[PDB]
Design a protein around this nucleic acid. Structure first.
Length: 85
DNA sequence: CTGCAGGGTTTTTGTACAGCCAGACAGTGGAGTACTACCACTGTGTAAGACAGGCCAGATC
């Protein structure tokens, strides 16, 4: 890190790994991994969450209720928590 | 100091071999899928005032 960046932790791990996987490759993973960080969501971008709360009329406590449920059962939580909304 | 010009630097950007796995293509017969209109039918507009005519009460003469 010192010679080529100086404190850039994320990328060194990311570029070796995605491509290392697609080395002995079935592709399946490349979709999930190429989506994984910057575009988009992964889970769902907090703006899409916010809209899907505000615009379907979910009570805050109701929303969180759902969030807990989807998180605990088979999760891999999707929805973003309240304080990040 | 500016201007451009040989080449330096490191690094891009791709082509070069050759083998190989993945998943798309195409079939099927239809499955049961997913998304579609369509059907009546709804919810939110929410309280005062002005104006005419009566006529009785009661003051004023």
């Amino acid at each position: 890190a010192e010679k080529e960046e100086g404190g850039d932790v994320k990328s060194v791990c990311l570029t070796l790994f995605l491509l290392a996987l697609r080395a002995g490759n079935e592709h399946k993973q490349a979709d999930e991994l190429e989506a994984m960080m910057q575009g988009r969501g992964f889970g769902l971008h907090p703006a899409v969450c916010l809209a899907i709360r505000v615009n379907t009329f979910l009570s805050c406590s109701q929303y969180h209720k759902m969030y807990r449920t989807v998180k605990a059962t088979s999760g891999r939580q999707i929805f973003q928590p309240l304080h990040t909304l």
